[PDB]
């Protein structure tokens, strides 16, 4: 009986480690001997250690992920796609935890429950990727949504943080209601909630005889809810406001982690929910609109975080290009784009957090950065060019292969929109590089040097971005392996 | 045995060495940059000597895997057409270094480093036999030249000229990239030796030719897109103009000779 | 004689929101926001840069009706910045931007009313 739980040690470990960290923090924060120590950095380091140990548990136990698959069949399904998605998710969480260490000291964020809630959200997303049922997917989505609602309003005294948390909670609850109504309408029309059953019942009757109103409506509502979750327009109701008002270490996590898991869910819904290519049209329109709106909205931004939010929306549209073209080479392009975008976003948010110790708010603030810190300016310019998609950098490979996938299915209209949006994006990305190097402001802002964690993260990510084209084979190999394993 | 690998790695080592040298040692930076440029030029001259002039096959071929299924890979080779372009693009760099000798105390290491990266990226352009990677190194030159035009410009107009050059180059680049993608999907590979032995349908030849012309005509200004060249030429350092007039204007002609015409 | 700092000293009357009138000192040639920063009426960490694009009307001031004719007219950028941050998308018709008002020796005794503070941390 104990060996049936060999498939859930990575989750059991992280759950128990979160419990131990919570007990440790609550016991020793409210202590008289140690004069109420602000043990946020301690809990952060121990949580990073826990993440690394559960990464070791999950990665090493690769043959054991299919163990007791019949017993766990109704609960979750673990396969090669889940394995790599979960490993990438743990890596991103560890990177975010590493970045947010300096936030706890200079700004004096002494609340240790931030790390505990991050770990609980990580557990929710681990259960999300392997979820093979509507019920499990909904529960994991709600768990991570609550863990994010709580930490979005962590800055209680801040006007922006409270409003951002309120807007985030309202939007997320509305999206969850729409998704949940879609799930109810699907369950009431087919009588099944498991993905295997829901694939066997829908794969044959491909609207050949008539269009099932209930099934079509449920599919549409689930798609709409998921589109709210990833903030693809016109379902970006308050996403820029949430990104701006949220704390920067918090904004770093929501910009990366909630996207990997939700995209995994959308893929595991496409494996069965391809009902008459209905989602392919919805994602087609959503991707075009997302690229256009992100490109046309990030040029009218003077703040760094709003520009990052609109960049995230544009890259979500670029990724949804892969959804619109349903093929192995489309899903592979989608996953490569997700990986590259996550790494670039981690790079950019580490750079922003490095300058956040001096309260950077506007693009003009980073005006004379090429004179005071002439290597941080180079790193930020590299990240901006990678966002733009300049050929020599790693950001070009994702857009290249996504455009190739789009042209494979024969959608020539998507390619033209992507090209125009790429031109606009490159313009407003090199606009930032103009400020750092070419302008000569009268007043300069001097920043204090960053710490070791963010310096190492920036160095590694910048070496990845510039030198990815030389050795891109492993990423393509693992991505092609994941895309094929979605069905066999 | 002198091959194309060493000729490309010499500027790489030259740029890496200067990357980690203190800026106070101005003499050492200039000496090492000039020595690297001269060594690269001598390497090119030696490559000329051992060049067979009786075979149409590409010589000194080198391969390095890029995609996991060897669909597209780093294929480097020279022929009687691109040999002199390589020699010229390695000869011009030491002259550019020597131009800014007196004033180098103000530019710093980022000047010689930018020129060495330029040389590394332009040697690979004339040596690539893969259509897609020829585009990758074709439009990687923008970043070093963008930095050269903007950081070390003459007046405040340097921002406008850099924007115009970059925007025109992007407009050509992506419209050519779409054609490259269409060729890759249909043919199956992007190797020049395979693309030169594939019978393209008559209808697709005009569209692909126009798309290739869009990117190349900008870099060899015909008539309607010759309005960026004068502004970029005037708003550039003395050595920067040599690169734009000596090499960057030879990309369009070489692109027409190597890909479009066959 | 010689060049005195007092030769470019602009005397101003700044009223903080609770109706107290205190006399601030500025330099002719620098922005009025800089003059307000010297005493501490406006937090220097909120408007560290005297630039239009690095501004969200954190330097908003209320100039007197009779003291507004001796100033350059509001530019398009100033109006655009003023409208968005008004929280009501309305124009007060007498509110200027601190970073866009350059002090001058003809502005001796200009009465300026500083409105209430607004959040700027993130």
């Amino acid at each position: 009986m104990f060996n049936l739980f060999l498939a859930v040690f990575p989750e059991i470990f992280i759950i128990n480690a979160t419990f131990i960290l919570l007990i440790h923090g609550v016991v020793f924060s409210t202590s008289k001997k140690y004069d109420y120590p602000p043990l946020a950095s301690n809990v952060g380091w121990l949580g990073l250690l826990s993440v690394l140990i559960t990464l070791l548990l999950l990665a090493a136990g690769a043959p054991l992920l299919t163990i007791a698959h019949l017993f766990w069949n109704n609960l979750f399904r673990r396969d090669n796609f889940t394995y790599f998605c979960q490993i990438f998710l743990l890596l991103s969480t560890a990177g975010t935890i590493s970045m947010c260490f300096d936030f706890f000291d200079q700004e004096r964020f002494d609340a240790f429950e931030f790390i505990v809630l991050i770990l609980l959200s990580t557990c929710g997303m681990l259960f999300m990727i392997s979820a093979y049922d509507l019920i499990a997917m909904y529960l994991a989505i709600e768990l991570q949504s609550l863990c994010f609602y709580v930490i979005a309003a962590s800055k209680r005294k801040s006007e922006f943080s409270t409003e951002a948390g309120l807007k985030y909670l309202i939007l997320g609850a509305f999206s969850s209601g729409i998704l949940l109504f879609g799930c109810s309408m699907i369950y009431g029309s087919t009588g099944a909630t498991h993905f295997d059953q829901l694939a066997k019942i829908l794969t044959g009757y491909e609207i050949t005889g008539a269009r099932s109103s209930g099934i079509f409506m449920g599919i549409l509502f689930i798609a709409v809810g998921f589109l709210f979750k990833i903030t693809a327009v016109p379902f970006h109701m308050w996403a820029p406001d949430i990104y701006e008002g949220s704390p920067t270490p918090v904004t770093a996590f929501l910009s990366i982690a909630p996207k990997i898991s939700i995209f995994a869910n959308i893929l595991r819904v496409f494996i069965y929910g391809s009902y008459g290519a209905t989602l392919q049209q919805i994602f087609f329109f959503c991707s075009i609109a997302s690229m256009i709106l992100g490109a046309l909205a990030a040029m009218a931004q003077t703040k760094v975080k709003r520009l990052l939010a609109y960049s995230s929306i544009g890259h979500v549209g670029y990724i949804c290009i892969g959804f619109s073209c349903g093929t192995i080479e489309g899903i592979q392009s989608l996953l490569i784009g997700i990986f590259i975008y996550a790494l670039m976003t981690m790079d950019a948010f580490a750079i922003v957090l490095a300058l956040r110790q001096t309260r950077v708010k506007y693009i003009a603030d980073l005006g004379a950065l090429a004179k005071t810190n002439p290597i941080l300016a180079i790193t930020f310019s590299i990240t901006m060019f990678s966002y733009a998609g300049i050929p020599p950098l790693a950001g070009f490979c994702s857009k290249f292969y996504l455009f190739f996938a789009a042209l494979g299915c024969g959608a020539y209209f998507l390619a033209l929109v992507g090209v125009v949006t790429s031109v606009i994006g490159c313009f407003y990305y090199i606009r930032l590089v103009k400020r750092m190097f070419f302008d000569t402001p009268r007043t300069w802002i001097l920043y204090e040097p960053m710490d070791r964690n963010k310096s190492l993260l920036l160095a590694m990510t910048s070496f990845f971005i510039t030198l990815f084209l030389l050795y891109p084979s492993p990423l393509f190999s693992v991505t092609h392996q994941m895309a094929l394993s979605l069905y066999l | 045995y002198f091959n194309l690998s060493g000729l490309i790695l010499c500027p790489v080592l030259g740029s890496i060495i200067l990357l980690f040298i203190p800026n106070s040692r101005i003499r050492l930076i200039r000496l090492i940059g000039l020595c690297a440029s001269l060594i690269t030029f001598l390497y090119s001259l030696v490559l000329w000597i051992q060049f067979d002039s009786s075979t149409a096959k590409f010589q000194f071929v080198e391969s390095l895997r890029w995609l996991p299924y060897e669909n597209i890979n780093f294929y480097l080779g020279i022929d009687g057409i691109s040999l002199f372009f390589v020699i010229l693009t390695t000869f011009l760099i030491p002259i550019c270094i020597l131009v800014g000798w007196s004033g180098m105390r103000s530019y710093g290491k980022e000047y010689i480093i930018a020129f060495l990266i330029c040389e590394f990226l332009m040697i690979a352009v004339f040596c690539m036999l893969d259509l897609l990677l020829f585009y990758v190194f074709f439009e990687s030159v923008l970043i070093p030249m963008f930095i050269i035009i903007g950081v070390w410009g003459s007046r405040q107009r340097k921002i406008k000229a850099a924007y115009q050059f970059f925007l025109y180059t992007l407009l050509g680049s992506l419209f050519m990239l779409l054609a490259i993608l269409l060729i890759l999907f249909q043919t199956g590979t992007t190797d020049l030796q395979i693309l030169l032995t594939t019978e393209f349908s008559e209808r697709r030849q005009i569209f692909l030719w126009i798309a290739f012309f869009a990117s190349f005509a900008v870099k060899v200004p015909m008539v309607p897109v010759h309005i960026w060249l004068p502004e970029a030429h005037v708003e550039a350092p003395t050595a920067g103009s040599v690169i734009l007039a000596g090499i960057l204007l030879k990309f369009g002609t070489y692109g027409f000779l190597r890909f479009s015409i066959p | 004689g010689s060049k005195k700092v007092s030769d470019r000293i602009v005397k101003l009357s700044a009223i903080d929101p609770d109706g107290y009138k205190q006399d601030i000192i500025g330099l002719s040639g620098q922005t009025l926001l800089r003059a307000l920063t010297h005493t501490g009426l406006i937090d220097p960490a909120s408007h560290r840069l005297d630039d239009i694009e690095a501004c969200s009307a954190e330097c908003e001031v209320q100039i007197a009706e009779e003291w507004l004719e001796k100033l350059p007219p509001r530019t398009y950028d100033e109006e655009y910045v003023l409208k968005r941050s008004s929280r009501s998308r309305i124009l007060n018709k007498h509110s200027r931007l601190g970073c866009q008002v350059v002090l001058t020796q003809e502005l001796q005794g200009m009465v300026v009313a500083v409105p209430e503070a607004k959040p700027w941390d993130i």
């Binding site: 046309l296 | 115009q164 309005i227 | -």
Partner: peptide
């Protein structure tokens, strides 16, 4: 050059994106 080629070019009239990007607040 300075006329039709510029007005129909990238900045004579293609700078309407300033009158187009700023409208995205709607």
């Amino acid at each position: 050059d300075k006329g039709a080629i510029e007005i129909l070019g990238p900045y004579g009239i293609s700078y309407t994106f300033r009158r187009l990007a700023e409208r995205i607040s709607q």
